[PDB]
Design a protein around this ligand. Sequence first.
Ligand SMILES: [Mn+2]
Ligand SMILES: [Mn+2]
Ligand SMILES: [Mn+2]
Ligand SMILES: [Mn+2]
Ligand SMILES: [Mn+2]
Ligand SMILES: [Mn+2]
Lengths: 589, 589, 589
Amino acid sequence: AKDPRYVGNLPKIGIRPTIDGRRKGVRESLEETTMNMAKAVAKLLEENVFYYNGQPVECVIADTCIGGVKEAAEAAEKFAREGVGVSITVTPCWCYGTETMDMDPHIPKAVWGFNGTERPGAVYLAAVLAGYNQKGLPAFGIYGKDVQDAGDTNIPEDVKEKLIRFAKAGLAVAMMKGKSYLSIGSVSMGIAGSVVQEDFFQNYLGMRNEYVDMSEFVRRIELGIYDKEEYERALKWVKENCKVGPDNNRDGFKRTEEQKEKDWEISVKMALIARDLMVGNKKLEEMGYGEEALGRNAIVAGFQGQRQWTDYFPNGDFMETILNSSFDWNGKRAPYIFATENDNLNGISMLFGYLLTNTAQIFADVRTYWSPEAVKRVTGYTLEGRAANGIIHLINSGAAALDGTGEQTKDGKPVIKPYYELTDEDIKKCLEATQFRPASTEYFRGGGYSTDFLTKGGMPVTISRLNIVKGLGPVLQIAEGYTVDLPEEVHDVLDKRTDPTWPTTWFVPNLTGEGAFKDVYSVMNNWGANHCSISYGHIGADLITLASILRIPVNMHNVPEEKIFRPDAWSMFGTKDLEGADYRACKKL
Amino acid sequence: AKDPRYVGNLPKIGIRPTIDGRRKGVRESLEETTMNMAKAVAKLLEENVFYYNGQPVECVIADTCIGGVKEAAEAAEKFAREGVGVSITVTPCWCYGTETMDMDPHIPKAVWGFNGTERPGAVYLAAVLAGYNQKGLPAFGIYGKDVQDAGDTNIPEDVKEKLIRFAKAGLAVAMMKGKSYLSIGSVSMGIAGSVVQEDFFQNYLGMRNEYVDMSEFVRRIELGIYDKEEYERALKWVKENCKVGPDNNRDGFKRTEEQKEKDWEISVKMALIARDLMVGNKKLEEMGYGEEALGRNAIVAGFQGQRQWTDYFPNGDFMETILNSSFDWNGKRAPYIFATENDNLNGISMLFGYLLTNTAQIFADVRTYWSPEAVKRVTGYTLEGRAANGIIHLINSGAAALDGTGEQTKDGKPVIKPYYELTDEDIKKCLEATQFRPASTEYFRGGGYSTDFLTKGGMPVTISRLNIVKGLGPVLQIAEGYTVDLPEEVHDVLDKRTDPTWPTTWFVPNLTGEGAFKDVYSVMNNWGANHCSISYGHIGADLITLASILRIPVNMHNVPEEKIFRPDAWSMFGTKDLEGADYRACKKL
Amino acid sequence: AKDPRYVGNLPKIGIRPTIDGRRKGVRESLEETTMNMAKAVAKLLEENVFYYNGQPVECVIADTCIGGVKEAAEAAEKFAREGVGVSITVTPCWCYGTETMDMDPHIPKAVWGFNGTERPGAVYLAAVLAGYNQKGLPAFGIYGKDVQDAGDTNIPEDVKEKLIRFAKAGLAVAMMKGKSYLSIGSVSMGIAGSVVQEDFFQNYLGMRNEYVDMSEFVRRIELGIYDKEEYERALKWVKENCKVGPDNNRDGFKRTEEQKEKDWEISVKMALIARDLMVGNKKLEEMGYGEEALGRNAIVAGFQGQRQWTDYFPNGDFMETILNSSFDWNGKRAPYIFATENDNLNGISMLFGYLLTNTAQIFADVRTYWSPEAVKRVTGYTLEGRAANGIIHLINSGAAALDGTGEQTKDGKPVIKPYYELTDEDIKKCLEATQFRPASTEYFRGGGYSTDFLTKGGMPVTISRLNIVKGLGPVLQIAEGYTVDLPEEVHDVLDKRTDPTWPTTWFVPNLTGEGAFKDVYSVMNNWGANHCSISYGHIGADLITLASILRIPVNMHNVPEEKIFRPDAWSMFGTKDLEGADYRACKKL
Ligand SMILES: [Mn+2]
Ligand SMILES: [Mn+2]
Ligand SMILES: [Mn+2]
Ligand SMILES: [Mn+2]
Ligand SMILES: [Mn+2]
Ligand SMILES: [Mn+2]
């Protein structure tokens, strides 16, 4: 399938049916069963893994079973021509290891060996994995716990989970290759994550780095380099659906009625310009701006904003809010991963979660750790339930996807859904639960509008953050948990003394009693940056698998160890201490 | 303050109050609060951290709050000009990360972010730490667990503990820079730690290595190159305060009355010469020995002794005992860290504890592990209380600070206090509990006097040892515990069959039931050398912090995990296995 | 002396007079001669090395001769308090190597041993250098070729050259530490050198990295955040001294009279804003812009310009031209090193040359290699003299210091002089030889004015370029040579078919017949970037010494090998192939 926004086609998954090369009876008796395995996996993935636009992932099966190097080469050739970016080998029998291996170092790969007795399928799995480990080509091993009878095409639940987790992680990795990260502006207020380290994007993600000074926005606004007809529709949509909340600026800092109207007009134009920069716009070509019409083929981007832009122009809160949302004046759509303060590392943190879920991601500041003692002192209220041991205030500096309201619903529960599953009611409620507040001029002299909402509680979420550390390189931290509800009056008190015009999410991380998860305080004390990305659901296991494919160690996570799924080679670096083995594997491999 | 013994001034602690650069609002409303925060830290440190001579540590505060690079540069300039060797950044608000950072890679640094709600102080803390981690400049992060109201001048207990631990560790590290280790003699009886590895002193401690052959003592004794007036006073003092115990040498090995008198005279001259070599002596100038008067500016030194010196001259027991003590014929004073058998690694182990506590350190041999079974077999006594699981006999080859008697008392408990807190009674009791015994001529042919005492039990102590391992470099081991009392009859039996003319300390390490602390046997079986250093108190956490500043991994320690305080970067190398992360961080950073 | 533009004081040079520690006659007889050596060096440097503002460098001599570690520590202490950033040890006798060494790893250091016979001065030089080499502390060795009689205070010419070369290089290195590189804008048109690699600035130069989006210029222009009184004086000065040349834009691309006037006004404001950003401006504080008044303490900066800024606003040609010049509407002054296209690596290339000469540096594109064959075909003229083997066209995209005209004169020859040596005539002639041309709108849509001049021929110059290569890090290339004159009609033809509105310098590199200097073509074919920096004079030897102090290998240079002066340690890595030894030394040390 053609990628609807970026150059090229969406990555496909190649299935390699390996077989015993011996004829005279052996191979002849196994071709049908082997191909059936390949077809079963293709069916499973097509029903469980989808591209960001909702289309089911597409699979490519080798033209013949693979019993030797000639057929292995043929599969490699077909996969290269078909645009395969992930490979899965399947077999119910013994096959000749190195002769049948996928030797492409640039493709995530897994091997599923049927747990049958008639033929040495597990023997092949273990044999070929030894080969992948010996040759330095990381590969995932999938072995079902229960013996299945010959010919059984039903895929066991444990096998299904691994195939799907591998496929999603593999697809996410394949998705980033060749795409750009667009840096709009430069470093924002000395934030480390806004410094662009090209080596990371190039060598770990296979991405390109593009740059554009914020003065580009001045030019496009002044010369009207954007779809004027869309602009008018957008402004109208905003006036009808975006409710303006109270102005907290005290008289001396309040902007005039005229300024506030201009703040909206420019805020909308900023949204159009940012999107046009990321994916281009044919309309610009028709207007006589052919170069600008091309776009920067960016699957993720960031906007510096403070201090230079915001000291004079409306801030990027609205732009950053709307782009990351799953809808706007043009209807429901996939989000455009966009980082506040040009924090490219948070942008990538968001991108990882997005590519694994197809859901909008929430950019946030790890603002305050509220202990039970502190909440009791300040409000007189004793935290209860999930919040009993403390909570963490997640709140970005004025911008957050409207999906963050938690108003979208599934089975009577709060969630964030892929845009293609949204109902008109879901969207309507997200908007109703949001208030747009005139920006605090003491911080944002140029005005603008911040996003004010409160995430509904009880929603499972995962916060994560990618950091780059000297002497180590990229490193990922993860914290699965839940959003919580506080009594209205309690929230109001904690909220008012912090930043009531910004978006709030009350978070409680799952505790393990060990490491950085002994208590809630420790989770925040061990967070390596001032920002994090929030995704709906518990995607820690998926992030761990994705990280291992990228050779990015995970310094902190609260995912049950039984759910850790990494390439087989990792176990060769240690089975007692998985964390240490992870660092050793990422460094050597 | 001027260092009373070494070149230059004592290290100062610089306080950097960082602030939001935005004026016409934010900055003006935070100027007083931020500067007051800095002043509060200075006050706290001045009341809890003291130089080795008892003077309160001196702090330097930036002339203005730091909101950008210009002010950061001005703070760096002022700090360099005023002799700052440790820095602490403080703030209650958001500040511009890299623009406000302390970029001096040569000084220990910490950042304390106020846990307040009104401004993003914790956001700055995490943001700047991400910067320190990204740039490879280790920095400690201090974040209080309970939200405090704006302007709260009171520093919470958890924050206080971190500020003080960091300050003490940083000051100790700063104290060593530029000072010398003086090797008197060469390798002693093939002891690995008596081999001097200049790279360690130079690159890890910033120290210089000086050398002087023991023949220097022959020249100074023969030519009278020492303060003769002091010598006469010292001899008189020894005769009046140093009690001579029974001679255990049997006929043939017993020295004459004349020899024993000369042994005392030479032993005292040795003490004077050793001290003169370490810090110089202005008196030598008028005597016509100007070069010798200078000294070697050594904050630590060692004396080979066996086998060359002791095969003919009185041993170094008295010299090694007196220098390390907190008092002598000239009154109470700071110890002169001096290593027996020129074991420079034990000398540094002692120096670490000394610089962190200002208390005399005990040099000791890890002589015998006494299991409950062994004690029962040999004495018929069943070890009780803290000693119930076994004890370790710590006893140097004849020398130990008189402070080791444990006669010094505070609140009715045995301790070792900084010399400036000593009472006349403390000193008298230390001397009364000590007996000087004629050295065993089978070992020490030249005679001398060994120190015989028994450390009082119930005193919290910490033993430690620095080792240098090929392929790793320096590595530190720590064991907190207590001294114990044994029934007199039991002690006598164990003592008589070991070395009753030497100083005894019965030690029991705290057990954790894990690692090398599963049992008392394991603690000794895992000790990496024949020597260790004993400090009063449980200073393991302090030592761990100091080790991390020095990038020296800790291979073994029984400090509760919750008390481990290392630079923020360490967590980036692992949160589940702190030991592994420590090795990874020390090597890469 | 106080640095007139940056925080702190200008670096001082410390002189360490080492001596034999032996009294009884030796030391007593040498103190006078040893101190006399120290004084002689101080005098020599004060008369030959000057700070960028023309003030003579300041030296600090140790309070006593250094015969041991105590005195060495005293010198280190005095130097630290006096602001010493470069050290030179001097002695006419034998001294105790490691006991007298300068152990500061962060200070460039040299040792001058008197070539006398009475005392082993050369023995000390060789002995201590062996120590510096063994300890990994690079130090330069200075030994005169001719034996001098005892007490001779005259410094031989060969010794003088090394002392001065070391001092200038050392001072240049000391000058950069603690200063900022200010990035104005982001990457310019995918130019590699405009990507900022913080690790380079931090670890090699000890510099800070500051960032500001070009939108800052929009704000300051719109809100009048600059000295309006100076602005008026500047505009008047421009109208009176900057002659406007012909407009080459063809009708359809010509800007109106009104636009051209605005182009001048904005171009001038850009100059003021850029300078204010680099060093601050007290006037801004008086105007109510206290934060902006501070500046970014930048000793070098860059402006992205194309494509974002220039697509709408007047280009940075005038700003980049005037800042780099040695004069403007406020009179003669030190240049402000400013990089076109935010090429920070060319900015540093320029900074190296500037700090070694105090003269304005020329930013240029290595545009065209003109072979004799090509010139003959295109013009019918046969290149003569120095140009006989071909020439290289150096011409930046519209900006160049007016000093580049070569109109400044000394002894009837064309030169570029430090601003403090300029005569009114020199300045007047630089302006008269320059024409400001309306910018080519096909490239610069926002207009502006390019600098059009022709560098006078016969001037000795050195072009250089710093590049950062993956797997190597920073690497420097140098090409000494001369500017040449072409017959007027010949220049006109080559010029008109290239870019006649930009500044031209015709360059001929000195050839060696080997390496990258076998012919003129090879010099350009081996240039590692599209830009270079031009400095008056043959400063290749100075750049080589500076590079070795910074541990930056020199991949290409045409400096006679007899003039190569690097730390003594370099010879330990090879004496046959100096280039290979350079790479080996820079990597290991
Ligand atoms: Mn933020
Ligand atoms: Mn709200
Ligand atoms: Mn011993
Ligand atoms: Mn005893
Ligand atoms: Mn150019
Ligand atoms: Mn011209």
